[model samples]
Target chain A: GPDRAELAELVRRLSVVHGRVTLSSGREADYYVDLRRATLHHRASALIGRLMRELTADWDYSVVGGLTLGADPVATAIMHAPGRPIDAFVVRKSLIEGSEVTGQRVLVVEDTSTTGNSALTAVHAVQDVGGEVVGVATVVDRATGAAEAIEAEGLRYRSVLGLADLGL
Target chain B: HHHHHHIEGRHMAGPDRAELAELVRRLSVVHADYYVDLRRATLHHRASALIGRLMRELTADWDYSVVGGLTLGADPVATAIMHAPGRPIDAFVVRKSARLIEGSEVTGQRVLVVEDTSTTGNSALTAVHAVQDVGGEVVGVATVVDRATGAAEAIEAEGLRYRSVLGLADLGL
Candidate 1:
């Protein structure tokens, strides 16, 4: 159940002004996406939460995960979404002392993905912990071949919107 | 808009009487609480007194309205505003704790923020942002005394007007 018009509005409001921005992959772009404006809104927060649950309904995932800061809110919303029950965990860029990740199934998520380096780092971390990374879901993908990159790492990438679909 | 050119003892200054009086009127009616004993900076009490005096002076032309926080700080402020005669003012409390109230939405209203003291002004700024997020426009921020900890500057940086009755030196605290 995709509300194209509402989704378009959400994307329009979420995208922020940026110029000459560099990606983690050494590529440059003229804009940035600040998802907080949309994700923080009461209505948008609830919508994205529900959408993520529906997307991962059939997956045999035990936990939903994401990078810190931006991914925190989205993962929280997903965990709290009605009818969906999944453990939520965050991937810290730097590993902390005495932290254990013995056996867990992680479904990594991100607000927007460009080079997919951050998501890739998280995937490897989970794999190192003997955790099965079932899949990755992103709200907005720049279509910079991140899906292929994820596939190369043996993880599936699912996204709600893409650059071409957004007319960007 | 009345402009006044006056000599306060020895210093000659031009004061916009209308703006100052308007500021006083707004602060008085907004139901700011006077919780702190700002004796060292007595300017806090002085400012509230000045507003009260102005309210009395403009009794014939002014209408009193009280706005304040819902706890200890606000109760006295509302009482002081109600004490003014001729212009009967009503008091409303801004609760610190969010409670369940069945309504459409209680945001975006014209609200006046009052605080005991501000160090960095974060408390007041959070209050203002929360109100504005739900569509409220913060008219002004009033505090009993300012501790000179950049609170006033921070509030002004957000583009909202800030007023303090007394400064840190005034209270010696």
Candidate 2:
């Protein structure tokens, strides 16, 4: 019964932790968006499966996946989402986990992107295994340089929600 | 709009024993001494596609409001069940090395600990403590594949119900 707008509100309520802390980039931030809190949630997880399926509908990807931990739930959500079946994969630090991506168009996914390193690393990992990576998608973009970084690699980048959506 | 079949209270039957065993057979990989590695199959899309319904049907009586376990192994299973058409079961992932509980704040919820595979049932118990530490009640433990080892007994020893969809024998291990 809820839509994209409802999904955004859920993220804000379930995620968005405010406090002074150092980030992975050695930068100080007053807040952190722990997107996993929402991505793995009951209501939010279902909405994510639906909204993300719609977000990446244009990719026509046969497979969707990303690095472990953060990307695990998102990948499974899209895989089980109602629509054309899109298989899911998990990329470990060294190998692609239990997925046959060879000769398939795959979409790299992430919960949140900052430096774009995680998403790009997933992209390279998929490519190394003969997966034709269509692009990278994230649930929350911190309005950082991830977009520019991913686009520089000659691939499209899309996000279901951005910093503005969360009022950050 | 999609039809609201969930309202009829009708249960959807997934793969039967024979069918599930065959599916698990194709997913198993035997090693030097009958050691089978099922991560490749358990975490694949094919498993995610069918395991949800089976898990839903098995754990139907638990009255669990949420499902999850330690990250990595139980992550996909929890996420998969939340997508099942019927009852809305929220999912969460408990960090193994960290002190964080992600997904629908589980402060006062009934949790069903889910695992991709089971051996000693130690991981499931650890997840049990993690959920309890957060003030969540552990209703039971469920796994997609059980090694037919001490997992069932170990869990039952805790006075909690334990259920597994497939055992080592099911996979012909």
Candidate 3:
């Protein structure tokens, strides 16, 4: 078992964006949620894996894939985490290669929450290849609009940490 | 410089240097076409197996608290080590963004950095510096492929222990 409180603490101490930067949604801001810090960490990944395992407790899916790099650790965490029965597969950029998700139900995953465009982009990409979107999950959400955008697509969207937890 | 695992005739994947080299040659993919100066092996299955064996054999004695490398490359390697049965090792990743180590209590812990390949050693060293900057003691640096370039020298110059489970010559680089 992993501690979500410890995971959240690690996220606050490490994952916070204290400088001006551009998020993946193409917008500029004074703060960014670069969640790779937590998602790729071994302990945090374990906590996240458990949370994700619980998050999808009732959902049925054959494979899990999403935009690469960001999705790399998250998807892999779920794969290595206990109680997950599905395979964790890599859904690369238009330029990388990996396993197939065709005709399978896929859950899109990301590291950060901004516009959720990247999450949606992953959803569409999987669908384009014949994979069904069972849900979308992330480690941190800006609480601005990413989750809503994901929900707009009629998919379940959730994150381990929201903006309110970050002192936003 | 002692290969410790004499218990098995083969510690790494292959039985001999040339045999391992040929295996890497067959499985690795290098795209001089449109990629970064990257050398990749399609050894997801083979490489994962090899790294697992190497991770157990290499760090079998260290008192380190964390294992990690710069992301994308070291992510798989580090995570695989964490999932192994023994060693209670927690993985960490030094992300390319913000230059801050994400995902572990490395503030005062001894960390062993890892990477998939090391041509210039920049990524591995970058991760090492970040770990130090965050108050983590770098017990050493580890890599899957050591280019035998300046990476080994630079890592040792930090006054930290260094070793690679394998090498670029293993890939015939």
Q: For each candidate, give its TM-score against the true structure.
A: 0.46, 0.86, 0.65
In the range A1-168, model 1's lDDT, one tens digit per residue, is 555447656766555545787965688887756664454344554567678777777888766666654554455456545664464555667531111234866678887776788788777777877878889998777878888888898788998767764555
lDDT of 2: 0.78
Candidate 3 docking band: acceptable
Off by over 4 Å in 2: A18-31, B1-19, B29-35
lDDT of 3 by residue, A13-75 (tens): 667768878767799887766676677555677788788778777888856657766777787
Stretches of candidate 3 off by over 4 Å are: A1-44, A57-70, A83-105, A111-114, A124-132, A139-144, A158-168, B1-53, B97-99, B146-160, B167-173
Each model's TM-score for chain A is 0.82, 0.92, 0.84
Instruction: Give the residue spans of candidate 1 off by over 4 A.
Output: A2-4, A16-31, A96-101, B1-173
Ranked by DockQ from best down, the candidates are 2, 3, 1
> DockQ of candidates 1 onward, in order?
0.01, 0.60, 0.26
| Top candidate by lDDT | 2
lDDT of 2 by residue, A1-168 (tens): 357888899899878888898987899999877888888776777778788888888786888889877888888877777788677788878478755789998999999888899999999999997999988888888888999999999999998888898976
- Restricted to chain B, the TM-score per model reads 0.51, 0.85, 0.75
TM-score for the first chain in candidate 2 comes to 0.92
Q: Among all windows of ten consecutive residues in candidate 1 chain A, which has the lowest summed lDDT?
A: A93-102
Could you give candidate 3's per-residue lDDT for residues B1-173 as a string of tens digits? 42221112134455533443454556553434422222233114344434545665676766787888886677777776776556567777777876466666688998888876655667888888888887998877776556556766766666867776655434544
Pick the DockQ winner: 2
Give the CAPRI class of candidate 1. Answer: incorrect
- For model 2 the interface RMSD, in Å, equals 1.8
Q: Which pairs clash in the backbone of model 2?
A: A42-B90
Worst 10 residues of 1 chain B by lDDT: B4-13
